[PDB]
Design a protein around this ligand. Structure first.
Ligand SMILES: *[C@@H]1O[C@H](CO[C@@H]2O[C@@H](C)[C@@H](O)[C@@H](O)[C@@H]2O)[C@@H](O[C@@H]2O[C@H](CO)[C@@H](O)[C@H](O)[C@H]2NC(C)=O)[C@H](O)[C@H]1NC(C)=O
Ligand SMILES: *[C@@H]1O[C@H](CO[C@@H]2O[C@@H](C)[C@@H](O)[C@@H](O)[C@@H]2O)[C@@H](O[C@@H]2O[C@H](CO)[C@@H](O)[C@H](O)[C@H]2NC(C)=O)[C@H](O)[C@H]1NC(C)=O
Ligand SMILES: CCCC[NH2+][C@@H](Cc1c[nH]c2ccccc12)C(=O)NCCC1CCCCCC1
Ligand SMILES: *[C@@H]1O[C@H](CO[C@@H]2O[C@@H](C)[C@@H](O)[C@@H](O)[C@@H]2O)[C@@H](O)[C@H](O)[C@H]1NC(C)=O
Ligand SMILES: *[C@@H]1O[C@H](CO)[C@@H](O)[C@H](O)[C@H]1NC(C)=O
Ligand SMILES: *[C@@H]1O[C@H](CO)[C@@H](O)[C@H](O)[C@H]1NC(C)=O
Ligand SMILES: *[C@@H]1O[C@H](CO)[C@@H](O)[C@H](O)[C@H]1NC(C)=O
Length: 526
């Protein structure tokens, strides 16, 4: 119940899971609270305590704007913070099997949310099922988001950028120093994350400071080369300066700008985040990772291309309908409450929403490549084309290109295509297999028979959980016992991938080949 860590004792709590027990330590601090003069700085190391820290409830979530697009609606509100917001939010959680394991492999979760939102306490990130079923240790941390986590004046230690990535890194360090006391093996640590959390995982593969802090990596629906994931230094300074003007903090001393921003209340900073860009989209990442010369030593596309990254195994994948969720956050003619049949002209207006700074030629080229119909008279043609545009550009083609370029330097990579739509999905059926809705299967929520998933979903989640655990423990995402399809390595020539669904698991090749040639080779030119 009580574990001695290098900064003090912590008390956990026992949970009953599937006729067994899991010990949970919720809300262990891993850094000094980044308050006052510490706002916008890299996280500082923790000073010891002599009490017993009671880690028996989730801690505060980091300050963030909330999704208010659909009040009362579970599909959006399940992603909203479920603990108090506070700048005092640098805490982590640990789930361990009971009895205490001897040398357990460790899975560290990094949540997503566009680098502007998210928290480790969400129901769909509950690590107790993985600890119970696979006898791994699960760790998750809160990290700063939005301008409080990623505001940048590159070079200036008062606001250097990437602070939220250094939060993640300091939690990785905490696991290295402390997890053996919990029965974990610090030499067998796998990072996993989704969307911006997966982009974060991919940046830890690039950052020399993270290379000794983990073993292997899992990237669900994200990678740093996605178009939303990295902010240019030009964009970053324009956005910091715009925030200053919107808050009355414009100065000529850049350090004086930061000191003035340090006296604003968190809510004043949050209120102005959306407006630091002239044209926002549903995928806007107003404050995100930058090339800071510290966490990130060079433009990450260069590092990837030239093989400058941790050499290890990776597991990467995407969902069938990544793009559909974003359509109801601004595209005309779309609604979660009807079937969103749109016209050609609405499609064209939708491209303006999603590609505001793109030339007319660029937008025509998207239309040309996505509107060559198998049948001109299917009413859902344009609705489905816009979702695929958004998903292929923002998630699928960057994930495949990351996997290709990473595998070219000699490491085993495994790619999946998740195509099962949750029987409980609160969003409409036209949105299909949405962004974020593989997470509950990875965390084993359908293994709880009391919670209304189908039997086929229980079996799918059980197999995914085993494959993820075998990847973390052994570097190989096989399910070896139940006559399962073998998961081949992804190589840049054959490009084999595994489909995940309740019916038939299949080996396929060259996912989205035609679409990704457009996005990866042509579209970056316009
Ligand atoms: C870089 O920032 C300038 C300034 O942005 C404006 O002021 C901010 C405080 C915020 O309120 C933004 O929403 C404003 O747009 C941008 O310049 C503006 O650009 C728009 C359209 O491009 C134009 O209508 C405004 O008149 C411009 N305002 C000024 C003062 O020049 C600029 O577009 C931003 N982006 C880039 C890439 O430079
Ligand atoms: C699907 O709904 C959208 C959104 O309209 C809102 O939601 C509806 C469910 C209903 O409550 C409406 O009263 C709401 O306004 C519809 O888009 C609207 O379409 C009308 C006419 O084309 C137009 O007046 C609005 O500007 C549109 N809203 C936008 C673009 O945001 C859409 O027409 C509906 N589609 C179908 C097939 O029913
Ligand atoms: C301040 C509240 C949210 C801030 N607006 C953006 C920020 C953002 C969140 N995830 C992102 C991935 C890439 C780029 C940006 C983002 C936004 O929510 N888009 C819609 C997200 C949907 C939610 C409904 C169903 C779940 C799928 C994801
Ligand atoms: C830490 O917790 C100690 C014991 O708390 C026990 O567990 C919690 C969940 C409650 O059920 C409580 O009634 C139990 O006794 C306390 O004795 C101690 O004061 C706590 N420390 C602080 C700083 O609050
Ligand atoms: C855990 O395993 C590692 C190798 O992965 C080994 O070096 C270490 O000594 C082990 N610790 C134990 C068994 O306590
Ligand atoms: C103002 O800028 C100078 C460098 O131009 C810097 O040394 C100084 O610290 C800044 N002012 C304050 C109060 O920090
Ligand atoms: C393998 O199949 C059995 C049923 O024969 C099932 O109970 C078990 O959970 C399966 N294991 C995995 C890892 O899927």
């Amino acid at each position: 119940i009580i574990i001695a860590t290098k900064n003090g004792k912590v008390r956990g709590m026992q949970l009953t899971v599937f006729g067994g027990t899991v010990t949970a330590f919720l809300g262990i601090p891993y850094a000094q609270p980044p308050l006052g003069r510490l706002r916008f700085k890299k996280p500082q190391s923790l000073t010891k305590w002599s009490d017993i820290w009671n880690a028996t409830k989730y801690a505060n979530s980091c300050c963030q704007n909330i999704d208010q697009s659909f009040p009362g609606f579970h599909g959006s509100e399940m992603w909203n913070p479920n603990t108090d917001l506070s700048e005092d939010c640098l805490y982590l959680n640990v789930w361990i099997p009971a009895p205490k394991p001897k040398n357990a492999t460790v899975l560290i979760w990094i949540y997503g949310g566009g680098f502007q939102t998210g928290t480790s306490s969400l129901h769909v990130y509950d690590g107790k099922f993985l600890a119970r079923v696979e006898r791994v240790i699960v760790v998750s941390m809160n990290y700063r988001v939005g301008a409080l986590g990623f505001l940048a004046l590159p070079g200036n230690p008062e606001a250097p950028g990437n602070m939220g990535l250094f939060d993640q890194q300091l939690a990785l360090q905490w696991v290295q120093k402390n997890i053996a006391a919990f029965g974990g093996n610090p030499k067998s640590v796998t990072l996993f994350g989704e969307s911006a959390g997966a982009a974060s995982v991919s940046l830890h593969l690039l950052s020399p400071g993270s290379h000794s802090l983990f073993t292997r990596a899992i990237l669900q629906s994200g990678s740093f080369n996605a178009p939303w994931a990295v902010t240019s230094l030009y964009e970053a300074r324009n956005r910091t300066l715009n925030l200053a003007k919107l808050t009355g903090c414009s100065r000529e001393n850049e350090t004086e700008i930061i000191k003035c921003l340090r006296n604003k209340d968190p809510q004043e900073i949050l209120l102005n985040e959306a407006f630091v860009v002239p044209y926002g989209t549903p995928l806007s990442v107003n404050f995100g990772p930058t090339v800071d010369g510290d966490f990130l030593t060079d433009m990450p596309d260069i590092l990837l291309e030239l093989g400058q990254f941790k050499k290890t195994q990776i597991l990467v994948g995407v969902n069938k309908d990544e793009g559909t969720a974003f359509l109801v956050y601004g595209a005309p003619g779309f609604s979660k409450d009807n079937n969103s049949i749109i016209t050609r002209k609405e499609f064209q207006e939708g491209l303006k929403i999603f590609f505001p700074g793109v030339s007319e030629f660029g937008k025509e080229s998207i239309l040309f490549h996505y509107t060559d119909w198998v049948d001109d008279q299917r009413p859902e043609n344009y609705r489905e084309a816009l979702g695929d545009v958004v998903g292929d550009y923002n998630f699928i083609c960057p994930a495949l290109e990351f996997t290709k370029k990473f595998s070219e330097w000699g490491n085993n990579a495994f790619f999946y295509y998740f195509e099962h739509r949750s029987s409980k999905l609160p969003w409409p059926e036209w949105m299909g297999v949405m962004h974020g809705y593989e997470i509950e299967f990875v965390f084993g929520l359908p293994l709880e028979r009391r919670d209304q998933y189908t039997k086929a979903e229980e079996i799918l989640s059980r197999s995914i959980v085993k494959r993820w655990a075998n990847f973390a423990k052994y570097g190989n995402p096989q399910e070896t016992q139940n006559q399962s399809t073998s998961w081949p390595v992804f190589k840049s020539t054959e490009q084999k991938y595994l489909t995940l669904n309740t019916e038939s698991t299949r080996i396929m090749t060259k996912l989205r080949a035609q679409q990704c040639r457009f996005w990866t080779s042509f579209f970056p030119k316009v």
